[model samples]
Target chain A: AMKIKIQKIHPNALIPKYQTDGSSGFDLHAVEEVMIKPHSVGLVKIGICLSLEVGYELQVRTRSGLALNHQVMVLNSPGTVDNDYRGEIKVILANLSDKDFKVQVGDRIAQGVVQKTYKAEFIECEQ
Target chain B: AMKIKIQKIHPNALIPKYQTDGSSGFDLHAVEEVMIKPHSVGLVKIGICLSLEVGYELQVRTRSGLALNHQVMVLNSPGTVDNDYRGEIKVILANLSDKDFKVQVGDRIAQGVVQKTYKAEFIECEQLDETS
Candidate 1:
C-alpha cells in the first residue's frame, strides 16, 4: 500500500481514493452538487487536505470515465499541487460535450498523483 | 531572482527552483527523451505558441525540491502561469514516490505570485484595504 498521510483540513471533508475501476483512474469527492447547462462551465469545490511522506511532483488529471464518456475535464488540465501545501482542494471543470452535464454530490471528477519535479530557476540573460 | 507579487485567493504556489545533485530529484527527465508515457502518465502534445505577453501567475509548485530525496510531492506540481493567460502553457509530471497529496493553485499552479494580470474583469474577487 502506498503510504501518505491525509488530514481532514475542513470539517466533514472527504479523503481521495485511487479508483482503478473508474475512468479517471482516481476518485475525488464533490463537496456540493453542481449542474451545468450545455456549453457552460461551473466551479466545483472539493474539500480535502494532504501531506507527502516523501517529496514528489503530482499530476492533476481528468478521470478517463468522465472525459471519454461525458466530456468532463479539468479546465486547467494537469493542474499542479506541491508537497508543502496543507489546504482545501478545488477543481474547475469544463464541459466539452454537446449536452448539459450534471454533477451530483460525491461524484469522482478528477484524479491526482504525486510526481517528481525539475525546477527551472529563471536567469535573465541578454540573449 | 525574478520578482512577482501574490494575493491569497486560493493560496500558495511554492517558488520553482534549481535541483542540483539529488537522487530521484534531478534523476529523470525520463530515458525516452520523448516518450510521454502514462506510466509516466502519457499526454500527447506539448508546444509553444507565444499568444501574448500575458501575465504570469508566476508559479505553482511542489515543495523544497520534492523529487525523491526519497518520496513526497506537489499534487499538480508547477501548476500555473498567468499574466492574463494568452493561454498556452502546461506541464504534466509524476508522483514516483508512492502516495496521496493535496494542493491550492488559486489562479495557477502551486505557489504562484501575481505577475500582473492583464485584464481587470476576469480578476474576480477583489478586496480593498483603504486604511490599514
Candidate 2:
C-alpha cells in the first residue's frame, strides 16, 4: 500500500478517504465557496496539498453523484497532478446545467485518483 | 512496456498513435462525420475496439488542444472501459462553443490512457497527518 503526505491548509478542509471498497479514488472537499454560472466554470479550492505516493500521478476526476444530480464536472477531467507537485490542489468545476449552482465550503467536489504513470512512444506502422 | 490488443471494425477506422514521446496516451480518431450543436453531446464512433493488457483500464480523456482551442471536451471524461470489453469504442464528445463543431471523418476526437486498476479502501480518522 502507498502512503501519501497531506497538508490541510484550511480549518474546514476535510481529510479525504475512500467512501466505498470499490472506489478508485477519495472524495475532495471545497475550502472556498463560489457561485458557478450556467455553462461556465468556477475555481474550487480544495484547501489541501499533498505529495503523491511513489511512482504515481494524482487524477482529479468527477464524482458520479455530482454529475448525475447537478451536471457538474471537473472541467479538466482527469486533471493531472505531477508526482512531485506539492501545491494547493484546485479543481476547475464546470456547471453544465442552465441554472445557477452554489458551492458551499467543505462540500465534496471532485475525486482524487492515484495511479501509475505511463509515458507512451508513438510508432506509426502499416502492416 | 505493455502491449494491448486492438481490432479495427470499420474500414475508415485508423490505428491510434502517440503524437509525442511525453504523451501519456494515444490519440483516437473518428470514423464517421457528425455535426455537434453547442453545449450538447455527440457520440463519435472510433470504429475499433480491443482488450486491455493483463489487468488495466482504458480511460478516454480530452485533448488539451481541443479543449483550449475549441472548447471541446469529453462529457464523461476519463471514460472507463472495462478490461474485457470488445466492441466499438465510442467517445461522448461535447461542444462547449456557441457554434456547431464539425467532426470530420478522420478528426482526432479523444485520447486513450492505459493505467492499472487500483481500487481504494477507506479508513477515516479523527485527524490525518500533514506534509511539511
Candidate 3:
C-alpha cells in the first residue's frame, strides 16, 4: 500500500474517499455547482492538488453509475496527472444525454486511481 | 519491466507498441472499419485477448490525438480488463464532435496501460479519528 498526499485548495472541498472496501478508486467531489448542456462539455473542479511518487500516475475516470444512468462521462477519461504536476485537479465532463444535467456542490463527479507507470525506451535494430 | 502475454485472435491484429521512449502507454489498433455518428458510441475491436497477472488490470484509454484533435473519446475511458477475462479487447469510442468520425481498419484507436491493483477490506469502528 502507498500513501498519496493531497492538498485541499478549496475551503469547502471534501476529501476523496472510497465508497466500499472493494472499490478500486476514490470518489472526487465537485467544489462548485455547474450546469452542463446536452451534447456539450464542462469543467468541474475538484479543488485539490496531489503529490504522487515517480513511476506513478493519477487517472481520473467516470463513475460507472454516472455514465450508465445519467449519460455523464469524463470527457478525458483516464485523464493523466503526471508525478510532476502540482495544479488543481479538474474533471472534464461531457453530457451525452439529450437533456441538460445539473451538477451540485459536493457531488461525486468522478473517481481517481493511482497506478504504477513506466517510461518506454526504444532502440533501433536491423531486421 | 513486466511481461504481459497477449493472443492475437484476428489475423490482421497488430501487436501494441509505445510510440516514443517516454510514452506511458502502448497504442491499441482497431481491426475493422467503423463509423461513429455525432454524439454516439461504437465499439471498435482490437482483435486480441490478454492474460494478466491476478493483481493487475489492463486500462483501455483514449489516445490524445484522437480525443483532442478529432473530438473522439473513449466512452469507457480507462475501461478495465480483469485478470480472468479471456475475451477479445474492444474499445467503446464516442464521437463528441458535431460531425461523424470514421475509424479505418488498423487505425490506432486507443491506448492500454497495465496497472497493479489492490483489493480493499473494511472494518467497522465506533469512533472515527480526525486524521483518518
Candidate 4:
C-alpha cells in the first residue's frame, strides 16, 4: 500500500480509511460544520500533503454514497493530484440538491488513489 | 464491457454508467425529491449497490458534464468500489452552485469503472546496480 501522512488542523478531523481490499483510496470525512450558500462554491482543505515520486499520478474522485442521495459532487470530475504538488489538499464541492447545504464534521469528503504515469518525448508525425 | 449493478433507494436515486468507451464508470441517477437546507449538506444514498470481487477494483468518478453544466458532481471524485462492498451506496453532497438546485429523479449522479489490481510483497531498498 502507498503511504500518506495527514496533519490535523481541527479537533474533529479524522483520517480516511479503506473499506475493502480492492479499494484504491481512503474516504475523507468532514472535520467541522460549515454552511455554503446558493450560487457559490466551497473549498475545504484536507490538512494533508502527499509526496509522490516522478512518473506517478494521483486520481481524486467522488464518493457514490454522497452523490446519489445528495446533490453534491466534485467541481472537476477526475480531478488530478500531481506528484509535484506540495500544498494542502483541497476539495471543490458543488451543490446540486436544490437547497442550501451544510457540511458537518466527519462527513465523507472525497477519495484519492495513486497510479503509474509515463513521460513521452515529442515525436513529429506526418498528417 | 464490464458490468455493474445499481439499485434504487429513493424514487430519485440512480445507477452509474460510463460516458465514453475509455469511461470505466457510469453516471448514477437520483431517485427522489427532498429538501437539503442551505448551509446544510445531505447524504443521499444510491438505491443500487455494487457487488464486486477480488482482483478487480471499480473506479468511481464525478460527472464532468453535470459538474460544468449543472453545478453538481460526485462528492468524492475518485471513490472506489471494492468487489466486496455490498452496502447501499451513499453520496455526501455539498451545494457549491449558487441558487437552490433541485435534483429530480433520474438526475445523473456519478460514474464508475472496473480496474485490475495485483498483490506484491515489499522488497527492501538497495543501491542501484548499473546494467553492464
Candidate 5:
C-alpha cells in the first residue's frame, strides 16, 4: 500500500478514511454547511491538503450512494489533483434534482482515490 | 499495459480513442441524437460493450470541454461498470446551462477510464484506532 500525507487546513476538518479495507476510495467530508439550490453548482471545501508522490494523482469522484439516491453528483468526476498541488481540496457538486439540497458540515460529500500515473512523451511519426 | 476486449454493439458505433498521449481517458461517442432540456438529465447510449478483467472497472466521466464551456456535466460522474455487465454503455448527462443543448449522433459525449478495483469485506471491531 502507498502512503499519502494529509494536512488538515481547517481545525474541524477530519481525515479521509475508507469505509472498508478493500474500498477503492476514501470518503471526503465537507467543512462548511451550505444549501445548494436546484439546478445550481456549489463548491464545497474538504479543508485538507495532500502531499502526493511523483507519478501519482488523487481523483475526486462522486459517491455512488449520493448520486443514485439524492441526484447530487460531482461536477467534474475524476477531478485530477497533480502531485505539485498543495491547495485545499474542494468538490464541485451539481444538484440535478428539482428541489434544494442541504449540505451539513462533516457530511460525506464525495470520494477521493489515489492512483499511480505516468507522464507520456510523444514523438511525431511520419507515415 | 492491459488489454480490454471491446465489442461494437451498434453497426455505426466507433471505437473509443484517447485524444492525446497523456490523456487519462478515452472519448466515448453517442450513438443517437438527443436533446437535453435545461436543468434536466438525459441518458445517451454509446453503442459498445466491454469485457474488463475481474478486478477492473470502467468509469464513465464527463468531458471537460463540454462541462466548462457548455455547463454540461455527467449526472453520475465516475459511473461504475461492473466486470460482468455486458449491456451497452450509456451516459447520463445533466445540462446545467440556462438553455437546452442538442447532442448529435457521433458527438463525443463522455469519457471512459479503466481502473482497478477490489471487493471489500466488513468485520466488526470493538474499538477503532485513534488515527482511524
Candidate 6:
C-alpha cells in the first residue's frame, strides 16, 4: 500500500477518499464558496498539502460529473503536484458554461490521482 | 523498464514522444483538423491503439500550452485508458475560450502520462476514515 502524508491547512478542508476499491482517484473538496463566471477561471483552494514519495505526483483531474454536468474543468488537468512542493494545494477551475457555477464549501470540486511518473530521456530521432 | 505496444490505426496519426529526459509525459498529436466552438466539447481522435501492461493506465491530459493559450482542456482528464481496453484513443476537449478553437491535423493537442494504478479492496465501513 502507498502511504502519503497529508496535512490540512484549513480546519474545514476535507481529506480525499476513494469511493470504491477499483477507483483510481479520490474526491477533492473546496474550502470556500465561490462563483465561477462563464468563460472565466476560478482558483479553488484545497487547503491541504501533501507529501508524496519522490518520483510520484498528485495529478489534479476533473470530476466526470462536474465536467459533464456543469461544464467546469480543471484548467490544468493533471496539474502536477511536485513531490518536494510544500505549498497548500489549489485547483484552477474553468467555467465553460454560460451561467455562473457555484462551488460551495465542502462541494466535491476535483479528483486527485496519484501516479508514479517516469523521468524519460528524450532522444530526438527519426521515427 | 515499462514497455507499451503502440500501433497506428490512422495513417496520419503521430506517435507520442517525450520531449525531455526529465519529462513525465509525452505529446499526443491529432490526425484531423477540427474546430471546437466555445462552451462546447470536441472529441479529437488520436487514431492510435496501445497495449498497456497490466496495472498501468494511460492518462490523457491537457497540454499546458493549449490550456494557457487557447483555453482548451481535456474534459475527462486525467482521462483513463485501462490496460485491458484496446481502442482508438480519443481526447474529450472542452473549449473554454470565446472564439472557436481550431485544432490543426498535426497539432499537439494532449499529453499522455503513463502511470501505475492501485487496486484497493474497499471494505465496508460505517464511517469513512479521515486523513491528517
TM-score winner between 2 and 5, please give it: 2
Per-residue CA lDDT of candidate 5, range A29-113, in tens? 9999979888777888899999876557788878888889889877787775656778898888878788999989989988999
State the DockQ of every prediction.
0.02, 0.16, 0.18, 0.11, 0.16, 0.21
**Chain B TM-score list for all models:** 0.27, 0.87, 0.92, 0.68, 0.94, 0.93
Worst 10 residues of 1 chain B by lDDT: B23-32
Candidate 3 structure quality by residue, lDDT tens digits, B16-131 = 88765435678899988889998689989998877665566778887755765667888777788887887889999989889989999889988888777778899889998664
Q: A1-127, model 2: which lDDT tens digit per residue?
A: 7878999988877889998777799989898889988887787888888977656778888888989999998877887666777888888788889999999987889999877866433333232
Worst 10 residues of 2 chain A by lDDT: A118-127
For residues A1-127, write the lDDT of model 3, one tens digit per residue: 7777889999867778887777789999999998988877788899999887667778887888989998998877887666676789888887888999999999998899877785432222221
Off by over 4 Å in 3: A118-127, B3-23, B26-58, B64-71, B79-93, B100-109, B116-132
Off by over 4 Å in 2: A7-14, A18-24, A82-87, A118-123, B4-36, B42-57, B63-71, B80-91, B100-109, B116-132
- For model 6, name the residue pairs that clash: none
Winner by lDDT between candidate 4 and candidate 1: 4
DockQ, cand. 3: 0.18
Once fitted onto the true fold, the runs of candidate 5 whose alpha carbons sit more than 4 angstroms away are A1-55, A61-74, A81-113, A117-127
Which residue pairs show backbone clashes in model 5? none
Docking quality tier of candidate 3? incorrect
lDDT score of residue A83 within candidate 2: 71
Candidate 4 ranges with C-alpha deviation above 4 Å: B1-132
Best by TM-score: 2
lDDT by residue (B1-132, candidate 2, tens digit) is 566767788899887886644345778999988999997999999988776666677889886557645668887888988887878899999999788999998898788887877778999899998643
lDDT of 5 by residue, B13-106 (tens): 8878866544566788998889999878999999887776566777788876687567797878778888788788999998988888999989
lDDT of 6 at A87: 82
lDDT of 4 by residue, B1-132 (tens): 234444444444444543433233456666666555444566655677555544566655665555555555555556766777867776666445545667666766565545666669987777775643
